[PDB]
Structure formats: C-alpha cells, structure tokens
Amino acid sequence: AKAVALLLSHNADIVLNKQQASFLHLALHNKRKEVVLTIIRSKRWDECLKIFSHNSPGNKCPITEMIEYLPECMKVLLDFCMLHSTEDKSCRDYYIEYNFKYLQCPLEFTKKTPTQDVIYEPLTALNAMVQNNRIELLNHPVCKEYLLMKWLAYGFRAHMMNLGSYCLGLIPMTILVVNIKPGMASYLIKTCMILVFLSSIFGYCKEAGDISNVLEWIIYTTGIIFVLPLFVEIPAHLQWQCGAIAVYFYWMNFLLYLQRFENCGIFIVMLEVILKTLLRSTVVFIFLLLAFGLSFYILLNLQDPFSSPLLSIIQTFSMMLGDINYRESFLEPYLRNELAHPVLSFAQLVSFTIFVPIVLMNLLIGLAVGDIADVQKHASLKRIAMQVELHTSLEKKLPLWFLRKVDQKSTIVYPNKSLEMEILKQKYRLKDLTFLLEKQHELIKLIIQKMEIISET
Amino acid sequence: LLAFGLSFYILLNLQDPFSSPLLSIIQTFSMMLGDINYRESFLEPYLRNELAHPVLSFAQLVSFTIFVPIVLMNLLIGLA
Amino acid sequence: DISNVLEWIIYTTGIIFVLPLFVEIPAHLQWQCGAIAVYFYWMNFLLYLQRFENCGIFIVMLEVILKTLLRSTVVFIFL
Amino acid sequence: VGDIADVQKHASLKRIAMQVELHTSLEKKLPLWFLRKVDQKSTIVYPNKSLEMEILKQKYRLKDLTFLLEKQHELIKLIIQKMEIISET
C-alpha cells in the first residue's frame, strides 16, 4: 500500500499492460485489501476507474471486479457514496444524499445497435452482487435506496400497467357474470364482451414478450371461449364451462398480481413448492378415495349407503369433506349387532378419521418444511435476487429516451415524513507468512554459506 | 369469496341456494365457516342427475374443500 | 423397513382371499382378508408410484411417520 | 419436526445416498451380458429439447509453517555454534 501511495503521489500514468489488466485489476485479482483501499481513499480514483478497456473478457469494469474479488472494499466504496447533513441531527431537518455512480454504467452502453462495443447490463453492479451471492452488499443502505429508486421510477409504474390491463379483463367478466343468468345464450353486454376479448389478445402479446405462465394460459384461452358468440355461435354448455373456469382463476391470479406489489419475492418461489404439494395431494387423495371407498364397500355392504361401489366411494368422499354422522353410520349399527366385521370396521375408523389425517399432515408439513427451509435459507438473498432480475428484464425492454427523463443519479431522503470472510482473510495473511519465512530461510542458508569459520572449524 | 362465490353461481344455478349471486356468495361464505351438508347440496343432486356440470362441480369441490384449505395453510405457515 | 411389512400384509391376505380355488374356506375369513388387502394395495401403490421420483426422503420419512402412528395409537386408546 | 429436521439436515445427502444403493443393489443382480449393451461410457446432452475444507487447508499450511521454522531454527543454532567471536568475546 505504501509503495502504491508513494507512486500515485507522483505523476505515474495509469496505463494498461497489453493484457488489458490494469493497475486496479491487478491488485484485485490477488485480493490485496490494503492496496485498493489506498486507491479508493486517495485522489485520481476517477482517472483510475475510466481505463477498464471494454474489449477485455477477463478484466472487466473494476467495480464489477471489486464485487467479485474484494467485496469488503466495495463496502468502503459504498460508504463514500452516502453523504450526510450537518452534525446537528435535527429530526425535522435531516439531509442524506445517496450517489449511484458506482452502481450502474452510463445508459449509452446499455443498448445500441450502432457504435456499441459490448452488451453491458443496465443494473451492472447489482447483478454482480447477486451472481456472486454478496448478501452483505445487497443489504447496504445505498443498494436498498437504489432499488427503491428504480421501484418508484419505472418498476411500480409497469406493475400498475400490468395490473391495469389485467383489471381491464377481470372487471368485465365479473360484470358479465352477475348481470346475465348462467346457462343461457341490454346494449352493455356487447361492449363488455369485446373488452374481455381485447384484454385477452393483449394478454397473449404480454405473454409473448413457471406457474404464472400456465395460470394465465387457463385464463386467456377460457376468456375467448366465453366470449366466442360475438364471432361464431358456440353451444352454451361449453361457453359456461369455460366461463366458470375463467372466473375462478381470475381471482386466483388477482391474488398473485396484488401480492407482487410487495417486493417479497418468496411467494413466487413458494409457488413452485405449493403446486408440487397440490400435484402430490391430488394423487394421494384419489388413492385414499379408492382404498377407503372399496374397503368400506366390503366391510359395510349390509348398510344402505355402502351398497354399491359408486355409493361407497361417494359416501367416503363425503367423509373426507367432513359430512357424516358417525353415530348413525357406524356406532348405532354396532350396538344393534348388524355390523359384520366390528373389530375391522373400528380399526378402519381409527385409521381413516384419526391416523391418515395425522400421518398425512405430519408427512405433508414435513415435505413442505423441507422445501420451505430450502427457500428460507437464502430468503433475503432470493428476495433481492428476483428483485433485480425483475428490474433488469424490464430495463431491457424500456426505450432509451424514456430513461433519459425518469432515471435519477442521486436521491435525497428526509427522515421527517462475517465468518467465511474472516477465515479467507486469515488464509491470505498466512500465505504471506509462508512467503516471508521462505525468503528469510534463504538468507540464513546464505549466512552459513558465506561466513568466517576459524575457531570452531 | 368472490372466486368461489361466482364459480358456484355458474355451475350450480339450477339449485335453490345458488340462484342469485348474493345467495351464492352467502352460501359460499357459509361453507368457508364450515356449515353445509355436502350430501344435500352436491352429492344427492349428482345422483338425481340434475347437476349441469358434474365433472366440474366435483373438481370445484375437491379444490374448495381440500386444496385451498391445504394449499393456503402450507403457504400461510410457510410465510409465518 | 416398512416396505417389507406392508407387502407382507399384502401378500398373505392376497392368498387367503383367493384360497377357494384350492381349498374351501368360510367366506367370513375370505372377505376379512379381502378388505385388508384392498385397502393396503392402494396404500402401497402410493409408495410404488412415489418411487418414480428420485426424492428418497419419503421412505426416510416412512420410518418417522410409522413411529408417529404407533405412538398415536396408544395415545388415542388412553384418551 | 425434531425427527424431520434430523432427516432434512442431510436431505440432499440422503437422497443421493439411497439413489446409488438402489442402483448398486440392482447392478449386483443384473447379468453381465445385459450390461454389455445398455451401459454407455458417454452421454451427449442438448439444451434444445466450504468452511470445513477451508480450516483443514489452513491447518496443513500451518503444519508446513511449523516444519519450516523448526528447520530454520536449527540453522540459527548452527550459525551461533560455528562463528568468529573475537571483539565481543
């Protein structure tokens, strides 16, 4: 560090080395904390930053190299990004300014078909944090306020545009169902019919440009078949069949759209978990319905509701929903001694009403909490992870002239309104200890090599 | 209450308690509280063959009485 | 394991249900073992169809949940 | 959840653990001529269709540091053993 600070105090030019690994990149690849902190805490740091030589594949922009290699020095760099007010901490007047110059590239290098050497990402330093799992840097107050700035600038406005077009189809079918009578087929339905058709065709163009895809596929095909009598006369049975599927699945996905106003992304991550639970519990349920429906058909065939295998599987379907009188079905025929297999019928009752209730929920919660803890182990990581890729995918489709007005380089906030990195730091200290002792061992071998030995010869 | 109240209004409009969208959303509000006889409401009209969409009405029953019970408590305890 | 004892209930009650091809058995013991076999078929058919997944934790949780079932059968009979 | 967390603590371990012993028990009963056709030495896939090991690495680096300093301590004991001492005798 002192050799860097002495050479940078003089006019030493900061130039590449024909491998395009410059003065700053060479100190980062060796993970030298005290050197890059000396370049940060001195002058000519902006001159040192502007020479990153775009065509180099292995030596990128050094802010991205700082996130990959020495993230503790990026934290000191982000401490300099956060300014402050005067020392009088007035609760009514407090002035904190943030700087996002070390968090994104200039927007000319984001997207250009001419005069572009590279394909640089719009949120460059944040995506470097989530690709190297730098969770200490993502919970930094500058990176929080940067994401909150991109939220209020364009991220909230596109989610309101997303839910605005979804409510443009959700509200008309809700109006269309309550007004007219189901099972049949003024001057308001015809405009209401095409408004479903307009929002569903726009739904395909939104889908053209997971489980959120398959939920809207059920939404946007059953929307058309419900409104098809403006084009072609369809029978009313298939119309009201697809109507009832579409209405039920509208307010299912409207819960999912309204949840996405939160930046808690773990709901969509848990959506992959809970559909696998639902696809597991639909084959579990249909096989309990076949096991218990046929077992009660054999044991209870003298009774009336278990006379037929259809009647037995309907009655067991009624019991799984929770509607039977166990006195009149089982226990009062037991005291009448009209029960054929009374020790087996009770053993089937203790299983079906107690055991496979509790041996299934112990199994389903255990299979849930195994998969849920796999989500919660990087919960704060994954929440910010799908926060930035929601923002960078939306940035790649926004126009350039739109971003010229809405993007800000600085926000002013007013309040009146460590173990993995420790052992790695100890490994580099020990690696310099082995290098120093091996240099010193060569000198002691050279003292004994060139020495006056007369008396003790 | 709006999804299942309107979906049961379409599928079960031939029956008495689902005749009106207010009556359908009251009856589904009664089912969410846990007070209906599923025999007299669904299964006995199924054997009478007065059910219009019987494969859909059962698929709505397996969802509303089993799935969104357990797909919600798996989601709410997991978010808890 | 438990997959061995589940098929033992399956494969002995299968024979006693079909024993009237060899020897005339009374129909009460035949339909008793029939109802045990049919209920335990689709129990283990859930276990066979689960094994197409490479998620092996179901069979590991099978050791857990039978101990829960053998604990809740003595808890229930004493309540 | 006491017993389930004992399963989930090595969940990714145990899933692959009973994956291979399901495969090796099935391999021991398969015939040899059957495996001559079905076994492949190479697959071609088409997509168009760290803390325990860190301290152990630091222990072996420190164990070589104790060995080098003990070798070097014998040389400094040998410089002081064979040396010209006239003025500061």
- Binary contact (A244, B52; C-beta < 8 A): no
Q: Residue A430, by phi and psi: left (phi above 0), alpha (psi -120 to 50) or beta?
A: alpha
Name beta bridge partners: A82. Answer: A98
The three-point CA angle A247-A253-A257 to 5° equals 135
Q: Which residues of A touch D85 (CB under 8 A)?
A: 455
Cβ contact, residue pair C57, D17, below 8 Å: no
Q: Helix A141-150 vs helix A71-81: angle between axes, to the nearest 10 degrees?
A: 70
From residue A146, how far is each of A19, A63, A77, A104 by CA, in Å? 34, 16, 15, 10
Q: Which of C36, C34, C37, C40 is nearest to C20 (CA)?
A: C34
Between the alpha carbon of residue A92 and those of residues A97, A228, A380, A415, the distances in Å are 16, 60, 32, 8
Could you tell me the CA-to-CA distances from B61 to A63, A240, A318 in Å, in that order?
56, 17, 11
Experimental technique behind these coordinates: cryo-EM
Six-digit token string for A16? 């590449």
Tell me which residue of B45, B17, B13, B40 sits closest to A247, measured CA to CA: B13
Is A341 in a helix, a strand, or coil?
coil
Q: Which of A178, A282, A368 sits opposite B21 (nearest CB)?
A: A178
CA distance A360 to chain C (A): 9
Q: What is the resolution of this structure in A?
A: 3.3
Which amino acid is present at D46?
Answer: Y
Burial D50-60 (b: 16+ CB within 10 A, else e): eeeeeeeebee
- Contacts of residue D70, defined as CB under 8 A and 6 or more positions apart, other chains included, come to none
Q: How many CB pairs under 8 A join A and C?
A: 60
Q: Which two tokens stand for residue A242?
A: 């697809």
Q: Answer yes or no: are the C-beta atoms of A234 and A228 closer than 8 Å.
A: yes
Name the residue facing C35 among A287, A299, A363 (closest C-beta).
A299
For A412, the enclosing helix (H) or strand (E) is strand A412-413
CB contact under 8 A, A298 and C38: yes
Note whether A199 and A176 are within 8 A (CB): no
Residues 6 or more apart whose CB falls under 8 angstroms from that of D89 comprise none
Counting as contact any 3 or more CB pairs under 8 A, the partners of B are: A
**Which segments of C are annotated as binding site for Ca(2+)?**
4, 7
Torsion of CA A226, A228, A229, A231, to 10 degrees: 160
Cβ A96 vs Cβ A83: under 8 Å: yes
The dihedral through the CA atoms of C15, C17, C23, C26 has a sign that is positive
| Lookup: tokens for B40 | 């007299």
Of A181, A245, A249, the CB nearest to B13: A181
The whole-angstrom distance between C72's CA and the closest CA on chain D is 15
Spatial separation of the C-alpha atoms in residues A111 and A200, rounded to whole Å:
31
Instruction: Note whether A158 and A249 are within 8 A (CB).
Output: no
**Mutation site, A276, A362, A364, interface C, largest C CB count within 10 A:** A362
* CB atoms near residue A111 (< 10 Å): 17
Chain D CB within 8 Å of residue C46 CB: no
Q: Which residues contact A17 (CB under 8 A, 6 or more apart)?
A: A26
Task: Give the whole-angstrom CA distance, residue C70 versus residue C64.
Answer: 10
Q: Is the CB of residue A54 less than 8 Å from the CB of residue A21?
A: no
Contacts across the A-B interface (CB distance below 8 Å) = 98
Chain B residues with CB-CB distance to A368 below 8 A: 74, 77-78
Chain C residue numbers touching D7 (CB-CB < 8 A): 57, 60-61, 64
Following CA atoms A173, A179, A182, A186 in sequence, which dihedral angle do they give, to the nearest 10 degrees?
A: -100
Closest of B3, B1, B76, B68 to residue A267, by C-alpha: B76
Does residue C54 sit at the D interface (CB-CB below 8 Å)? yes
> Which residues partner with A413 through β-bridges?
A96
* Interface contact A369-B71, CB threshold 8 A: no
The minimal CB distance from D14 to the residues C56, C64, C67 is found for: C56
Nearest to A50 by CA among A9, A138, A109: A109
Q: Which residues of A touch D71 (CB under 8 A)?
A: 441
